[PDB]
Amino acid sequence: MNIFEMLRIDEGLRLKIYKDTEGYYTIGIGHLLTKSPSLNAAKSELDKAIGRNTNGVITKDEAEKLFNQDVDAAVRGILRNAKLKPIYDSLDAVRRAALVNLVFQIGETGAAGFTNSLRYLQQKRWDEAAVNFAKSRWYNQTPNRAKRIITVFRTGTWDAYKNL
């Protein structure tokens, strides 16, 4: 198990433009195209992203290319965010992956907004962090996924992704 396999489990893989849990145009492995309700606008972002005139459908290889970029970007951003870097540095590799996952899903801003939960993580108060994380729109809108992430933050093990 690793960040790529983990996010591949959580985001799935679709080669045609689809809408994410929030209703936004996405493709590949959770690659958000735009928040716009315009399909054309999403298609234009996709073409820009891939570098070719696509027609809304991409190859697996292309999808993975975007995904690698996305993961890398998620990590890069964590490292440039003063609210998150210290948390990230304080964690072991498995818990860091959970944090990357969260940021990939909700964005840096959204993630850095979990100030109190992050602080408990920093203090290594596992169970308390877990309880706290659940008190959020994030958890309520995507409870299955949030549960998984939370268990990883709580235990520092990949058990929750074992079997998916």
**Least distance to Cl ion from the beta carbon of 73, Å?**
8
Interior/surface letters 52-78, b for 16+ CB within 10 angstroms, e for the rest: eebebebeeebbbbbbeebbeebbebb
Q: 93-112 vs 115-122: helix axis angle to the nearest 10? A: 150
91: closest CA among 107, 78, 104? 78
Q: Compare residues 144 and 163 and give the one whose CB is closer to Cl ion.
A: 144
62 lies in the site for K ion, by CB under 5 A? no
Query: Is the CB of residue 62 less than 8 Å from the CB of residue 50?
Result: yes
Contact track, Cl ion, 105-144, x by CB under 5 A: -------------------------------------x-x
Q: Is 153 labelled as part of a ligand binding site? A: no
Longest dimension (CA), the chain: 50
Can you tell me the distance from the alpha carbon of 6 to that of 10, in angstroms, rounded to the nearest whole number? 6
Binding residue (CB under 5 A) for K ion from 3, 27, 30, 153: 30
Contact partner at residue 49 from K ion, Cl ion, none, CB < 5 to 8 Å by partner kind: Cl ion
Contact partner at residue 142 from K ion, Cl ion, none, CB < 5 to 8 Å by partner kind: Cl ion
Q: Compare residues 9 and 41 and give the one whose CB is closer to K ion.
A: 9
Catalytic residue annotation: 11, 20
Contact partner at residue 77 from K ion, Cl ion, none, CB < 5 to 8 Å by partner kind: none
How many chain residues interact with K ion (CB under 5 A)? 2
**Quick one: tokens of 93?**
């590799």
**Quick one: tokens of 86?**
């210290």
11 lies in the site for K ion, by CB under 5 A? yes
**Interface positions with K ion (CB under 5 A):** 11, 30
